[PDB]
Amino acid sequence: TDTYNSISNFIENELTALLSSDDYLMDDLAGPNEVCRLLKAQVIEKRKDAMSRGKQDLLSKEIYDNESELRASQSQQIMELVGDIPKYSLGSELRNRVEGEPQSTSIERLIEDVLKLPQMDLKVLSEYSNLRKDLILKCQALQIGESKLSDILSQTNSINSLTT
Amino acid sequence: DLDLDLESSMVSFFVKDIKVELFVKQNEIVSCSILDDIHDFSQNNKSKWEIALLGSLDDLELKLNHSFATIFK
Amino acid sequence: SEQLLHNYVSDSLLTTLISFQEFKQQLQSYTSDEQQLQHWYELLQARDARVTSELEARIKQFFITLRSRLLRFLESEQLSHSLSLETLIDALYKINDLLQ
Numbered sequence: 001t002d003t004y005n006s007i008s009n010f011i012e013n014e015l016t017a018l019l020s021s022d023d024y025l026m027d028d029l030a031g032p033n034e035v036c037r038l039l040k041a042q043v044i045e046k047r048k049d050a051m052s053r054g055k056q057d058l059l060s061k062e063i064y065d066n067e068s069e070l071r072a073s074q075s076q077q078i079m080e081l082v083g084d085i086p087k088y089s090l091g092s093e094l095r096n097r098v099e100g101e102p103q104s105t106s107i108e109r110l111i112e113d114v115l116k117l118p119q120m121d122l123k124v125l126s127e128y129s130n131l132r133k134d135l136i137l138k139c140q141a142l143q144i145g146e147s148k149l150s151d152i153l154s155q156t157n158s159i160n161s162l163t164t
Numbered sequence: 165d166l167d168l169d170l171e172s173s174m175v176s177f178f179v180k181d182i183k184v185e186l187f188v189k190q191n192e193i194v195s196c197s198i199l200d201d202i203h204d205f206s207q208n209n210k211s212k213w214e215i216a217l218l219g220s221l222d223d224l225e226l227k228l229n230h231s232f233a234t235i236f237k
Numbered sequence: 238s239e240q241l242l243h244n245y246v247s248d249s250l251l252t253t254l255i256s257f258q259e260f261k262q263q264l265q266s267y268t269s270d271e272q273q274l275q276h277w278y279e280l281l282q283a284r285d286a287r288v289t290s291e292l293e294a295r296i297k298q299f300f301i302t303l304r305s306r307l308l309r310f311l312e313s314e315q316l317s318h319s320l321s322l323e324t325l326i327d328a329l330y331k332i333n334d335l336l337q
Contacts, residue, residue, distance in 0.1 A: 083322075107218070
């Protein structure tokens with residue numbers, strides 16, 4: 001975002017240049033010649049070392065420091081807040097769904113994926129809990145389907161051998 | 165034409181004009197993919213074909229003829 | 238913060254470091270009419286006050302804008318790093334279809 005350019009515009013021209021130009025122009029408009037053209041020869045002699053560029057660069061630095069503590073505190077107050085637990089503790093196929101375009105679907109992931117999915121305003125809570133129930137139930141039905149199909153295949157080989 | 169490594173696990177070949185690649189841990193096929201975009205294709209049809217193609221390696225020959233003959237009918 | 242800018246603008250103002258005494262002694266060599274020079278000094282107080290209140294107005298506005306843009310960037314970062322439950326449920330529906 002580079003907020004430094006905007007802040008530098010604010011403290012370089014919007015603040016200092018405005019006050020300097022306004023002082024000169026308005027005090028010139030206050031008049032005659034001598035009073036204003038001399039009263040400002042002693043303002044340079046006593047406001048000196050206040051418009052040097054280095055120390056007002058430091059002025060931006062200490063306003064940056066003030067930003068540092070306020071930003072630290074309000075950074076915390078916003079970023080302990082987590083809506084749903086973050087990326088690192090979820091299923092890989094679940095990223096393949098939520099980000100889309102998986103290009104590859106299978107059964108092995110989704111089986112263990114729903115097995116290790118943890119249960120968790122009551123709207124989404126209840127529907128997610130019962131849907132996770134339903135899906136883990138469906139996948140265990142699928143693996144007992146392996147049990148049934150394997151048994152049937154072996155027994156079919158037996159009966160086919162007898163009949164042939 | 166297809167490419168094979170020293171263990172014949174990775175593979176990629178064209179059935180008619182579409183890139184289909186397979187990953188096999190053992191004799192059973194454990195993964196499928198279709199890597200071509202014909203400008204008549206729907207995402208629903210993509211899922212119902214790879215799931216069907218999932219299976220053993222011995223029934224791949226019969227299934228390739230069965231699935232890809234319905235598309236051009 | 239804001240008070241730092243108050244102090245800086247007060248230091249860079251004209252209305253305190255310029256006193257009536259040295260003003261009078263510097264002017265006296267050319268014009269000796271005390272009353273209209275007092276009037277001109279009184280004019281020089283008011284302009285400093287108006288410009289410094291105006292400066293406070295700018296610094297307040299810029300501070301509010303900084304809060305806004307900064308909070309929005311941090312919120313965008315948090316939203317990028319956060320997850321939504323509804324998208325997860327939508328994915329679970331597709332998982333159910335595949336299993337079926």
